[PDB]
């Protein structure tokens, strides 16, 4: 539109017209055009045969069918509409992450009513502990779990050898105390932004708790918003209230990568896309297309206003503006005509 | 992450004195605002201090439109 407006105007610019006349005509025409669009806007909640989502579904239908996934629109529209329906009412994109899993046909790309990780990290026992938890409780630790690894820096002085023994014992008692708080909490799944001590992993393995460390913060926020639990930094103040719960927890291979699953939370306002695809470039392109879809459907939910596609809007504006041009005599008429002639480009 | 000028602005807005000592949330020099929340404009996280002040407040103008260069021009003119 921008380029074609300029293109149609340029021949008149060959004539020595002061640009301000042109821009005045442009402003007037645009204001009139916007008013016309708003007049011929279409709502549906006045109508009878609309489901609160059908407009959204068809909106995704329309917007999608130009990008790289066009032949899977009947599928992706359903996923994205159902997903964004969960976003209420924060409406912000940061909640639902996008997960570019390598490999697989994008027809196999997954929508999970929960949170997953493309990440983990290998410590000693991470493969030892059971990796199924049917009805688990989610504990969310920001604080690290390791032997004063990066806690407050302190020099210590000890005369009696036995006191030195007691000192090392007391450090390990710190970590054991934290772990006991974790277990006696009754949860079985622990996630941490900060790294996890191997020994704590061993204890979780022995007592059949699952754990993981170094989880990226954004996905942790997703998780806590999902299972309803609140992230914790003080292990001591722990109580069942801040403990997230999920319908079922898992961690299953997809394309060689080690992922983590927990989903089915009935009250979860944030989901995530596992996006299969054989091309790394598909990952970015599909992600861009999906981002467009999500943000446009968000706008649609915000504003129950729809118009026809396929350039029909532009044609209607062209006709309306051209007819209006007859009314105003003088130099403005030609500029309005050029406005319409550029506008018809779509 | 507010800069010194920024917190000065906020100080003037709520009329509450910034406190270098973390402890004393003193009643008299403590903030008072009509409404504060977070909103989305232009895919930009925005913190809003929406206010009503009879005694007088330092208000702000929100500039909306496509081209940031036009923002520079228009804000310069304003």
């Amino acid at each position: 539109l921008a380029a074609e407006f300029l293109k149609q105007v340029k021949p008149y610019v060959e004539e020595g017209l002061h640009p301000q006349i042109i821009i005045r005509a442009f402003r007037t025409a645009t204001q009139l055009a916007v008013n016309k669009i708003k007049e011929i806007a279409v709502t549906v909640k006045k109508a009878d045969k609309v489901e609160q989502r059908k407009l959204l579904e068809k909106c995704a239908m329309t917007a999608l069918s130009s990008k790289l996934i066009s032949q899977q629109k009947a599928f992706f529209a359903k996923m994205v509409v159902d997903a964004v329906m969960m976003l209420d009412d924060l409406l912000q994109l940061k909640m639902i992450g996008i997960k570019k899993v390598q490999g697989g046909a994008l027809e196999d790309s997954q929508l999970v009513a929960g949170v997953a990780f493309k990440k983990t990290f290998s410590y000693a026992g991470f493969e030892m502990q059971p990796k199924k938890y049917h009805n688990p409780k989610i504990a969310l630790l920001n604080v690290e779990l390791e032997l004063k690894a990066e806690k407050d820096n302190a020099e210590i002085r000890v005369h009696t050898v036995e006191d030195y023994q007691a000192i090392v014992d007391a450090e390990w008692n710190i970590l054991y105390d934290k772990l006991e708080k974790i277990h006696h909490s009754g949860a079985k799944v622990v996630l941490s932004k900060l790294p996890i001590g191997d020994v704590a992993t061993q204890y979780f393995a022995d007592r059949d708790m699952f754990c993981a460390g170094r989880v990226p913060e954004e996905d942790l926020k997703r998780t806590m918003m999902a299972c309803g639990g609140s992230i914790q930094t003080s292990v001591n103040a722990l109580s069942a209230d801040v403990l997230g719960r999920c319908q079922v927890f898992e961690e299953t291979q997809i394309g060689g990568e080690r992922y983590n699953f927990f989903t089915g939370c009935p009250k979860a306002k944030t989901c995530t896309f596992i996006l299969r695809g054989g091309a790394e470039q598909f990952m970015e392109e599909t992600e861009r297309s999906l981002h467009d879809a999500i943000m446009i459907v968000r706008r649609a939910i915000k504003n129950d206003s729809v118009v026809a596609g396929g350039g029909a809007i532009e044609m209607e504006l062209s006709k309306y503006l051209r007819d209006y041009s007859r009314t105003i005599p003088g130099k403005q008429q030609l500029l309005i005509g050029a406005y319409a002639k550029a506008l018809e480009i779509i | 992450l507010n800069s010194k000028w920024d917190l000065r602005r906020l100080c003037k807005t709520v009329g509450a004195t910034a406190l270098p000592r973390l402890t004393p949330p003193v009643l008299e020099e403590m903030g008072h605002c009509d409404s504060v929340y977070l909103s989305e404009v232009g895919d930009t996280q925005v913190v809003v201090f929406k206010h009503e002040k009879e005694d007088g407040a330092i208000s702000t103008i929100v500039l909306r439109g496509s081209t940031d260069n036009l923002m520079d021009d228009i804000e310069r003119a304003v």
Partner: peptide
């Protein structure tokens, strides 16, 4: 959604305004 086309037209209009409102350009090394 109407918003897409509405914002499109507004942006294009002011783009034309901006571009056409320029007569000359100055470059500095």
């Amino acid at each position: 959604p109407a918003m897409v086309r509405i914002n499109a037209l507004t942006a294009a209009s002011e783009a034309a305004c901006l571009i056409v409102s320029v007569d000359e350009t100055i470059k500095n090394p």
